Design a protein around this motif. Structure first.
Motif, PDB file in Angstrom:
ATOM      1  N   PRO A 192       0.806  -1.231   0.000  1.00 10.96           N
ATOM      2  CA  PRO A 192       0.000   0.000   0.000  1.00 10.96           C
ATOM      3  C   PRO A 192       0.831   1.269   0.000  1.00 10.96           C
ATOM      4  CG  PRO A 192      -0.993  -1.588   1.451  1.00 10.96           C
ATOM      5  CD  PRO A 192       0.320  -2.179   1.022  1.00 10.96           C
ATOM      6  N   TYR A 193       1.904   1.338   0.789  1.00 15.70           N
ATOM      7  CA  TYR A 193       2.740   2.537   0.795  1.00 15.70           C
ATOM      8  C   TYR A 193       3.343   2.811  -0.585  1.00 15.70           C
ATOM      9  CZ  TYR A 193       2.291   1.317   5.711  1.00 15.70           C
ATOM     10  OH  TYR A 193       1.795   0.976   6.945  1.00 15.70           O
ATOM     11  N   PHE A 194       3.827   1.763  -1.259  1.00 15.95           N
ATOM     12  CA  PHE A 194       4.351   1.920  -2.613  1.00 15.95           C
ATOM     13  C   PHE A 194       3.265   2.374  -3.579  1.00 15.95           C
ATOM     14  CE2 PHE A 194       8.071  -1.118  -1.768  1.00 15.95           C
ATOM     15  CZ  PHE A 194       8.920  -0.049  -1.565  1.00 15.95           C
ATOM     16  N   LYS A 195       2.102   1.719  -3.532  1.00 16.32           N
ATOM     17  CA  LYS A 195       0.977   2.140  -4.358  1.00 16.32           C
ATOM     18  C   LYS A 195       0.634   3.598  -4.092  1.00 16.32           C
ATOM     19  N   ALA A 196       0.703   4.009  -2.826  1.00 16.81           N
ATOM     20  CA  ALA A 196       0.432   5.391  -2.461  1.00 16.81           C
ATOM     21  C   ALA A 196       1.402   6.336  -3.150  1.00 16.81           C
ATOM     22  CB  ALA A 196       0.501   5.557  -0.941  1.00 16.81           C
ATOM     23  N   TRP A 197       2.706   6.060  -3.052  1.00 14.35           N
ATOM     24  CA  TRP A 197       3.677   6.919  -3.733  1.00 14.35           C
ATOM     25  C   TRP A 197       3.437   6.957  -5.240  1.00 14.35           C
ATOM     26  CZ3 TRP A 197       7.538   6.881  -7.411  1.00 14.35           C
ATOM     27  CH2 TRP A 197       8.371   8.007  -7.433  1.00 14.35           C
ATOM     28  N   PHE A 198       3.222   5.790  -5.856  1.00 15.67           N
ATOM     29  CA  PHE A 198       2.993   5.753  -7.298  1.00 15.67           C
ATOM     30  C   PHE A 198       1.775   6.581  -7.689  1.00 15.67           C
ATOM     31  CE2 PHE A 198       5.567   1.690  -7.343  1.00 15.67           C
ATOM     32  CZ  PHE A 198       6.601   2.234  -8.083  1.00 15.67           C
ATOM     33  N   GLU A 199       0.687   6.478  -6.923  1.00 12.66           N
ATOM     34  CA  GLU A 199      -0.493   7.281  -7.226  1.00 12.66           C
ATOM     35  C   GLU A 199      -0.235   8.759  -6.959  1.00 12.66           C
ATOM     36  N   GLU A 200       0.553   9.070  -5.926  1.00 15.65           N
ATOM     37  CA  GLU A 200       0.864  10.452  -5.576  1.00 15.65           C
ATOM     38  C   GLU A 200       1.783  11.118  -6.588  1.00 15.65           C
ATOM     39  OE1 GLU A 200       2.540  10.312  -1.677  1.00 15.65           O
ATOM     40  OE2 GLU A 200       0.720   9.490  -0.767  1.00 15.65           O
ATOM     41  N   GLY A 253       1.578  10.530  -9.990  1.00 16.36           N
ATOM     42  CA  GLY A 253       0.978  10.619 -11.306  1.00 16.36           C
ATOM     43  C   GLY A 253       1.142   9.397 -12.174  1.00 16.36           C
ATOM     44  N   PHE A 254       1.213   8.213 -11.581  1.00 13.48           N
ATOM     45  CA  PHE A 254       1.373   6.985 -12.343  1.00 13.48           C
ATOM     46  C   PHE A 254       0.035   6.281 -12.511  1.00 13.48           C
ATOM     47  CE2 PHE A 254       5.606   7.521 -10.381  1.00 13.48           C
ATOM     48  CZ  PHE A 254       6.362   7.579 -11.535  1.00 13.48           C
ATOM     49  N   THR A 255      -0.160   5.672 -13.680  1.00 15.82           N
ATOM     50  CA  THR A 255      -1.341   4.848 -13.916  1.00 15.82           C
ATOM     51  C   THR A 255      -1.018   3.494 -13.305  1.00 15.82           C
ATOM     52  OG1 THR A 255      -1.743   6.049 -15.979  1.00 15.82           O
ATOM     53  CG2 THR A 255      -2.966   4.000 -15.625  1.00 15.82           C
ATOM     54  N   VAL A 256      -1.440   3.312 -12.060  1.00 18.74           N
ATOM     55  CA  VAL A 256      -1.065   2.126 -11.304  1.00 18.74           C
ATOM     56  C   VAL A 256      -1.935   0.959 -11.739  1.00 18.74           C
ATOM     57  CG1 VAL A 256      -0.742   1.155  -9.006  1.00 18.74           C
ATOM     58  CG2 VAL A 256      -0.377   3.603  -9.393  1.00 18.74           C
ATOM     59  N   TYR A 257      -1.298  -0.174 -12.001  1.00 21.93           N
ATOM     60  CA  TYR A 257      -1.986  -1.423 -12.270  1.00 21.93           C
ATOM     61  C   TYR A 257      -1.627  -2.418 -11.180  1.00 21.93           C
ATOM     62  CZ  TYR A 257      -3.128   0.263 -16.967  1.00 21.93           C
ATOM     63  OH  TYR A 257      -3.617   0.981 -18.034  1.00 21.93           O
ATOM     64  N   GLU A 258      -2.599  -3.231 -10.785  1.00 25.74           N
ATOM     65  CA  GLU A 258      -2.392  -4.241  -9.764  1.00 25.74           C
ATOM     66  C   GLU A 258      -2.663  -5.612 -10.358  1.00 25.74           C
ATOM     67  N   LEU A 259      -1.889  -6.586  -9.935  1.00 25.79           N
ATOM     68  CA  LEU A 259      -2.044  -7.941 -10.430  1.00 25.79           C
ATOM     69  C   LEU A 259      -2.999  -8.711  -9.536  1.00 25.79           C
ATOM     70  CD1 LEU A 259       1.506  -8.887 -11.628  1.00 25.79           C
ATOM     71  CD2 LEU A 259      -0.556  -8.651 -12.973  1.00 25.79           C
ATOM     72  N   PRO A 260      -3.566  -9.813 -10.028  1.00 22.60           N
ATOM     73  CA  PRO A 260      -4.407 -10.647  -9.164  1.00 22.60           C
ATOM     74  C   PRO A 260      -3.682 -11.013  -7.877  1.00 22.60           C
ATOM     75  CG  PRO A 260      -4.602 -11.381 -11.425  1.00 22.60           C
ATOM     76  CD  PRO A 260      -3.576 -10.278 -11.428  1.00 22.60           C
TER      77      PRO A 260
END
Lengths: 656, 107
Positions: free
Chosen positions: A92-100, A102-109
């Motif tokens: 979640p912290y990494f996803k947070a930085w990526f979203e913060e 300006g990245f189009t974040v994709y998540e895997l199953p």
């Protein structure tokens, strides 16, 4: 503008057993040295590129290894799905930085793990992306990446637990160069690596380099920063336009990570021409084999993984009763188009494609070269096989291993045919589609002897073929009389041997002593003078023995020649194609094959035999007893085996 | 070691468990074992070696001696034979006829 993301060791500790580098290093890191080394590396990399930092979190010490955050390409990032649970909480912290940022974040199953830039490294030219699978990353995740990032994904299999991450043994360098450690990859992945990278551009490292994480290096245009270099490694690197700057990172190695693991390049280049395709092939198969007990699935999955494939068992249905077999459907993926061919051929021995749509008929190809099959021809196995011709199942006749399957179309048949026998215009099965199959010396040998003797009596009473393959060891161990007795009572319907066993049998019959070397030629010369074994028996020079009983009771025998033959008996076939033909002839219709101490012969006769026949292989070696419940192996002296067999067969056929 | 009046677990109830190669392949297995040993040595890990006279017979006295010298061996489990053969090779440069053995033992 090259930007690199990093994370300081503000909460760094060692509390996991996640990888082989951590076993024994729990709470054994001094954060002072770690901080000093991290600061040194941060400054060194700051000298070459822009280094963004992220705030760590308490309770997530392995967050410093930013390479595992995800793979970033052109504002698009595939967020990582960690294999173990100890690092899934940091996602979640990494996803947070990526979203913060300006990245189009994709998540895997959640079931499909991928550990980011640690297992996915772009070629520096940007043409394609190397992606590793095997320990932490799944092969089944590599197509998604390609779909989401619009790039090609070349899959590599890691085989060593020490290098469970691609960036610990793999480093694309600028100028199209590749710095890597070949022993960390299986044979196919090394073949791929060489196919894509010219030999002049490959920098192979010695084992000493690899174990110190030499490949875990970060490269900005010509400078390469790593943990520690060899004089030889540094000199070879200098041979290319790269200038090495070394820095100590020993504290992080206690958690299996070096300079590349502590960095993640966020400015990845995008080429428009490449758009998006990946070579991996996936197939679903069903297995109805009743062996739910006894472990059929385990051999299937071990074959898949060992052959550089992946699997995920989809549906498992257990039956309602000891009578209903438990059957399952499995998805099997492979990095190469026809590595699937090898996996599927090995699988075919147990299960077939799912019914509703995956059933195709078999493909065939015409023979243009005499005695040469077209490449990718299906290789036959020992087990009985059916081929789907004209939407109908055709049983293959003359089933043999290591042959081609030739199909006839107007009368729709399929038969096993040797490569040399292929005639021009023959239709040979190709591919894997449409094929199915259907179902320390031994202390107490005497139990196996009891079983074998009873089986021999049973197959003899009903008229059944028994073939015996003999070697000179049968004579050397005192077994002439016992094998001769077996021949008398109709237990031997064919004999497969060579020159040596015949000359030794006849020598012991005439002169009493077998196996100083001159008696061999005297016997050979006499038998040659009579012009054959049959003539020498009919004249009265050979009065007893195995060959005598074979001629008398009119049992067919075939003596294959050898390079060791000191003198050919007139009977010994010195043209081995004729001998192989005669062997296949005499083996036909057999129910059991007693193999008596001819190792060279035993493998060849087995290669000639189908699976349905029971194979009895007897020897003291004992490794030549390893032939593979439909086959029995015995670890003893062959003469003792024959004596016990005759005794038990007496106790079985002598109630008089 | 059982002392009188000890309560010994009985039955199955209540118990649970938290629990010749070619030289080419030999050198790979040796690489793996050596790496594991280096890892265990670099921490406060204990390595124990059980040795027999075969170590001496095959010319391995010097190598085992190096392993003990370089701190890879924290305990040695052996017997009379390995000690007498090691000491014989150290004194007279040979090992195993029987005579030299006793003189060494006597010494």
């Amino acid at each position: 503008d090259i930007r690199i993301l990093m994370c300081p060791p503000d909460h760094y500790d060692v509390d996991y057993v996640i990888n082989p580098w951590m076993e024994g290093n729990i709470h054994k890191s001094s954060q002072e040295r770690a901080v000093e080394q991290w600061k040194k590396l941060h400054q060194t990399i700051k000298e070459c590129a822009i280094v963004d930092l992220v705030k760590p979190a308490k309770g997530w010490p392995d967050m410093v290894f930013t390479a595992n955050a995800g793979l970033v390409l052109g504002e698009n990032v595939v967020l990582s799905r960690f294999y173990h649970k100890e690092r899934q909480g940091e996602e979640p912290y990494f996803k947070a930085w990526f979203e913060e940022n300006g990245f189009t974040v994709y998540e895997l199953p959640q079931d499909l793990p991928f550990e980011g830039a640690g297992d996915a490294l772009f070629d520096r030219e940007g043409r394609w992306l190397w992606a590793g699978y095997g320990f932490r990353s799944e092969l089944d995740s590599h197509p998604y990446i390609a779909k989401w990032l619009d790039t090609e994904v070349v899959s590599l299999r890691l085989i060593d637990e020490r290098f469970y991450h691609l960036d610990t043994c793999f480093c694309p360098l600028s100028g199209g160069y590749l710095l890597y450690y070949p022993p960390a990859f299986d044979a196919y992945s090394n073949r791929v690596i060489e196919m894509r990278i010219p030999p002049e551009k490959r920098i192979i490292v010695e084992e000493l380099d690899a174990v110190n994480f030499a490949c875990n290096a970060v490269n900005v245009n010509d400078i390469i920063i790593m943990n520690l270099v060899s004089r030889t490694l540094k000199e070879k690197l200098a041979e290319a336009g790269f200038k090495v700057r070394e820095t100590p990172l020993t504290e992080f190695l206690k958690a299996g990570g070096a300079a590349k693991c502590l960095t993640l390049r966020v400015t990845e280049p995008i080429l428009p021409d490449v758009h998006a395709t990946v070579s991996i092939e996936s197939r679903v198969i069903r297995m109805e084999g009743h062996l739910l007990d006894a472990g059929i699935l385990n051999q299937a999955l071990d074959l898949v993984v060992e052959n550089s494939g992946s699997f995920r068992v989809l549906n498992f249905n257990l039956g309602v009763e000891r009578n209903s077999t438990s059957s399952a459907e499995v998805r099997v993926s492979a990095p190469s188009h026809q590595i699937m061919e090898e996996i599927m051929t090995e699988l075919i021995d147990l299960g077939a494609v799912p019914p509703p749509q995956e059933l195709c008929d078999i493909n065939t190809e015409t023979v243009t070269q005499g005695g040469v099959a077209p490449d990718d021809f299906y290789v036959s196995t020992i087990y009985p096989t059916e081929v789907r011709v004209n939407c109908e199942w055709v049983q293959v006749t003359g089933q043999r291993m290591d042959a081609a399957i030739v199909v006839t179309s107007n009368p729709p048949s399929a038969r096993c045919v040797l490569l040399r026998d292929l005639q021009v215009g023959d239709r040979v099965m190709v591919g894997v589609e449409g094929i199915r199959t259907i179902k320390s010396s031994e202390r107490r040998v005497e139990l196996l002897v009891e079983q074998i003797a009873w089986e021999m009596r049973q197959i003899r009473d009903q008229g059944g073929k028994i073939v015996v393959t003999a070697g000179p060891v049968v004579i050397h161990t005192g077994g002439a009389q016992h094998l001769s007795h077996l021949v008398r009572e109709g237990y031997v319907h064919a004999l497969l041997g060579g020159n040596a066993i015949a000359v030794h049998d006849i020598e012991q019959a005439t002169m009493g002593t077998s196996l100083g070397h001159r008696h061999h030629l005297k016997i050979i010369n006499s038998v040659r003078r009579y012009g054959g074994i049959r003539q020498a028996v009919e004249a009265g020079f050979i009065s007893k023995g195995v060959m005598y009983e074979c001629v008398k009771n009119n049992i067919p025998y075939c003596l294959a020649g050898s390079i060791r033959d000191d003198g050919p008996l007139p009977d010994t076939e010195m043209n081995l194609v004729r001998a192989q033909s005669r062997y296949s002839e005499l083996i036909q219709g057999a129910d059991m094959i007693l193999m008596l101490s001819s190792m060279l012969h035993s493998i060849g006769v087995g290669n000639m035999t189908p699976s349905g026949v029971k194979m009895v292989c007897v020897d003291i070696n004992p490794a030549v007893v390893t032939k593979l419940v439909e086959s029995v192996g015995v670890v003893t002296d062959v003469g003792l085996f024959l004596s016990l067999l005759v005794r038990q067969l007496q106790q079985l056929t002598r109630p008089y | 070691d059982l002392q009188v009046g000890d309560r010994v677990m009985v039955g199955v109830e209540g118990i649970r468990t938290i629990k010749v190669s070619s030289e080419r392949r030999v050198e790979l297995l040796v690489e793996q074992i050596a790496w594991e040993m280096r890892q265990i040595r670099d921490q406060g890990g204990k390595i124990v070696v059980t040795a027999g006279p075969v170590v001496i017979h095959t010319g391995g006295a010097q190598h085992l001696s190096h392993l003990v010298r370089e701190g890879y061996v924290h305990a040695l489990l052996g017997g009379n034979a390995i000690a007498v053969h090691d000491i014989e090779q150290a004194t007279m440069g040979t090992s195993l006829g029987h005579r030299h053995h006793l003189k060494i033992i006597n010494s």
